[PDB]
Amino acid sequence: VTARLRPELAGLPVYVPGKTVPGAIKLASNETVFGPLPSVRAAIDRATDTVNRYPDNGCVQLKAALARHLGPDFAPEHVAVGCGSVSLCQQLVQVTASVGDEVVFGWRSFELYPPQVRVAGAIPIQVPLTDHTFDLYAMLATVTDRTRLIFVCNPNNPTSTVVGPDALARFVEAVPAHILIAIDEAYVEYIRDGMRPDSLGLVRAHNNVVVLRTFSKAYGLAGLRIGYAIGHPDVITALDKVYVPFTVSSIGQAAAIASLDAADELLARTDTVVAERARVSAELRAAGFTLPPSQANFVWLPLGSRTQDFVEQAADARIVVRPYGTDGVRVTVAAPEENDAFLRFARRWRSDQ
Amino acid sequence: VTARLRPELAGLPVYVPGKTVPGAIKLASNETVFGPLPSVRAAIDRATDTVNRYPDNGCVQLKAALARHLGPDFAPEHVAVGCGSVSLCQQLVQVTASVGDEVVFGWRSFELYPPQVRVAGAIPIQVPLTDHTFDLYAMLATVTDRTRLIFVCNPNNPTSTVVGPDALARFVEAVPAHILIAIDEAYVEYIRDGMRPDSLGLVRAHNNVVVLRTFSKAYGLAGLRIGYAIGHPDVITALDKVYVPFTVSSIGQAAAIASLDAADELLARTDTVVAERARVSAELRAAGFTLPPSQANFVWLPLGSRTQDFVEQAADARIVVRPYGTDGVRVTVAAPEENDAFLRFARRWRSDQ
Numbered sequence: 001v002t003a004r005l006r007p008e009l010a011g012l013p014v015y016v017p018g019k020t021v022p023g024a025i026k027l028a029s030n031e032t033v034f035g036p037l038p039s040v041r042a043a044i045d046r047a048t049d050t051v052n053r054y055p056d057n058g059c060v061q062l063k064a065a066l067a068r069h070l071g072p073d074f075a076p077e078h079v080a081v082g083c084g085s086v087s088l089c090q091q092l093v094q095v096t097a098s099v100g101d102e103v104v105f106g107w108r109s110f111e112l113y114p115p116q117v118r119v120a121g122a123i124p125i126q127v128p129l130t131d132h133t134f135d136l137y138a139m140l141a142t143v144t145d146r147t148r149l150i151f152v153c154n155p156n157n158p159t160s161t162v163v164g165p166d167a168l169a170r171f172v173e174a175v176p177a178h179i180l181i182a183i184d185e186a187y188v189e190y191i192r193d194g195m196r197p198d199s200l201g202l203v204r205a206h207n208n209v210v211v212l213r214t215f216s217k218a219y220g221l222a223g224l225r226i227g228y229a230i231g232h233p234d235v236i237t238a239l240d241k242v243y244v245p246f247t248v249s250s251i252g253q254a255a256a257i258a259s260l261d262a263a264d265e266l267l268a269r270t271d272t273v274v275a276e277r278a279r280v281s282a283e284l285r286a287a288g289f290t291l292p293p294s295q296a297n298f299v300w301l302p303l304g305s306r307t308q309d310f311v312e313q314a315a316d317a318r319i320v321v322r323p324y325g326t327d328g329v330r331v332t333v334a335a336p337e338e339n340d341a342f343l344r345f346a347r348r349w350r351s352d353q
Numbered sequence: 354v355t356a357r358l359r360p361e362l363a364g365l366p367v368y369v370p371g372k373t374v375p376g377a378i379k380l381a382s383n384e385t386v387f388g389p390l391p392s393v394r395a396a397i398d399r400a401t402d403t404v405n406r407y408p409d410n411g412c413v414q415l416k417a418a419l420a421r422h423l424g425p426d427f428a429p430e431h432v433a434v435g436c437g438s439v440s441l442c443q444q445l446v447q448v449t450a451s452v453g454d455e456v457v458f459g460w461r462s463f464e465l466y467p468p469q470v471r472v473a474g475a476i477p478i479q480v481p482l483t484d485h486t487f488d489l490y491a492m493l494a495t496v497t498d499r500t501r502l503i504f505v506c507n508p509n510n511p512t513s514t515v516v517g518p519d520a521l522a523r524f525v526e527a528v529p530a531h532i533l534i535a536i537d538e539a540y541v542e543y544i545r546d547g548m549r550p551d552s553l554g555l556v557r558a559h560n561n562v563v564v565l566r567t568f569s570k571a572y573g574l575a576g577l578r579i580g581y582a583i584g585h586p587d588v589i590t591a592l593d594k595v596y597v598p599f600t601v602s603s604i605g606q607a608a609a610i611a612s613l614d615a616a617d618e619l620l621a622r623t624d625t626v627v628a629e630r631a632r633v634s635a636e637l638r639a640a641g642f643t644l645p646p647s648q649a650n651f652v653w654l655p656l657g658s659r660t661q662d663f664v665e666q667a668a669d670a671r672i673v674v675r676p677y678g679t680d681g682v683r684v685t686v687a688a689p690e691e692n693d694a695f696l697r698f699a700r701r702w703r704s705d706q
């Protein structure tokens with residue numbers, strides 16, 4: 001006899017992380033390539049002095065720094081902080097959804113969403129993409145009385161694309177006002193070409209809109225786990241009710257504050273990533289690959305049934321890229337020498353096809 | 354109109370942390386008082402270089418070290434790691450309980466249990482203590498067909514006591530074998546007087562027993578959030594299914610590994626805390642305070658309706674102690690000079706009654 005566990009656990013689609021392989025360049029987790037700035041390193045060591053003490057459960061000084069960086073329309077009451085935006089995704093489910101409820105999102109999208117929804121006893125409504133892009137029209141139509149939460153992943157992980165900014169505004173305006181809408185903006189700092197939506201204006205104009213952002217990519221703290229949500233104080237308060245206490249570490253909070261102080265410097269680096277993104281995209285298309293327009297720090301190769309082969313052969317060339325079933329491969333844009341290694345491999349692989 | 358949130362959120366008993374008051378003596382969060390060893394800071398220093406990279410989702414190195422420390426009868430498959438044992442408490446609830454299900458625990462016990470149970474839509478069965486100690490007989494009598502999880506907090510937070518080690522074994526033997534029993538051993542390193550149970554023996558003897566331990570107290574890493582569970586590989590596999598990805602940070606893992614390597618030095622320090630505990634207990638009793646026999650790094654003062662006054666008066670003396678309703682005050686055993694400052698206050702307060 002064994003302990004009786006919940007029946008939902010069997011076949012639960014557990015999250016599978018990007019691999020780390022000795023000897024290989026990693027283009028599978030959308031990480032930026034630079035270690036911490038001197039001031040960030042200093043804050044980590046300063047926080048290390050008092051590691052025997054619990055963190056601030058409320059991340060008070062971080063919220064004050066985030067509110068200031070968000071501008072005059074936002075105060076700390078509009079900000080929740082979580083142990084990665086992955087934690088905030090679960091907290092959103094925990095404040096909205098229970099047994100038999102529905103959570104709507106585009107698919108393929110962040111692989112985190114389905115299992116977290118299922119843990120709540122709710123059902124994920126996975127709405128197909130159109131041209132590798134969230135289909136807001138289709139998502140709206142599938143709303144029912146039991147729809148408790150909607151995720152819009154923008155830019156989308158793993159397809160890299162963004163919806164039209166005006167289209168997003170129309171969507172939010174059309175959704176029944178009682179349904180929480182979470183706009184996942186993990187990659188927002190990489191959006192160019194006038195495609196960034198007025199996400200903060202949407203949270204101002206609508207009490208049911210919450211925006212998720214992260215320190216893991218542009219701010220370079222994927223190792224330390226700081227995500228934040230921007231929303232209406234009632235929603236922020238609810239998220240803080242289900243927050244697992246102390247999960248955002250002291251060192252994480254201090255490192256995040258120091259990163260905010262260096263934001264001009266850190267955000268300027270995204271311009272370089274975007275330049276490589278354009279170059280990687282141009283070279284891949286010149287080789288004969290087709291891929292959608294990326295607004296993130298990665299590209300999406302919809303290789304279908306060939307994704308497994310591409311990834312295995314990439315591994316043989318000491319390059320780690322990220323497979324998504326039989327849909328495609330997500331390739332991070334990183335250092336120029338890593339991007340060149342990937343491009344050389346990609347040309348060679350497609351020639352062999 | 355506001356976003357519709359779950360009804361269970363209204364009046365949820367949200368976890369209230371111990372206050373942190375700059376300039377005051379903090380005896381409110383059961384923290385140890387020493388900064389990290391140079392070897393631990395060095396491990397953090399090395400990990401700081403790659404904070405741009407995600408942590409190991411599987412905590413492979415840490416699990417291996419934990420399994421070595423647990424001895425020849427335990428391998429990594431018996432160990433789950435969480436972002437604090439507080440996260441593992443939620444994971445336990447997530448693998449066992451949903452709407453209508455029951456979770457039984459002694460009360461007063463860990464403030465964390467009721468809200469996490471309610472977040473699952475489950476029903477907390479709160480079984481009164483007897484002489485400030487878990488009443489295993491009464492808890493057994495409360496078991497039903499809907500009992501999905503049992504918490505035994507040993508030593509108990511906040512009352513500081515343990516049940517008899519044989520009584521614990523008999524309780525485990527008498528609980529129906531399909532019900533998961535979690536033994537919360539956050540303070541196990543402080544148990545003396547032959548009162549420590551054979552919890553690892555119980556795990557080996559029973560597939561439905563899981564033991565929770567932490568790096569936050571004896572190992573002095575409260576700021577960095579590492580807890581671990583020891584159990585049957587099926588339970589561990591299940592806990593890892595609901596684990597929020599990457600929540601145990603890269604720096605936390607490195608610090609925890611370093612702390613295991615320095616376990617002889619760190620564990621030896623528990624003897625000094627134990628000596629202070631006996632000393633403080635004698636000083637309080639001589640000053641007219643009754644208290645149960647503590648096996649933790651804190652004592653429990655069953656002040657009843659006077660706890661608010663005691664805490665307020667302590668606060669005015671620049672001493673932070675932890676109030677629990679109209680039941681009592683939990684006071685951490687910390688540095689000798691800090692304990693003496695508290696004792697001075699305690700004697701003063703006593704004389705004013």
Ligand SMILES: Cc1ncc(COP(=O)(O)O)c(CN)c1O
Pocket residue numbers: 029030083084085086087110153154156157184185186213214215216222225226227
């Ligand atoms: C859309 C999205 N949201 C959240 C996350 C998780 O980020 P964090 O490291 O802040 O948890 C990811 C990971 N790439 C993502 O793609």
Ligand SMILES: Cc1ncc(COP(=O)(O)O)c(CN)c1O
Pocket residue numbers: 382383436437438439440463506509510537539566567568569575579580
């Ligand atoms: C019984 C018990 N369990 C778990 C915890 C949480 O410890 P951690 O810091 O590992 O989350 C505490 C905190 N005092 C506790 O008292």
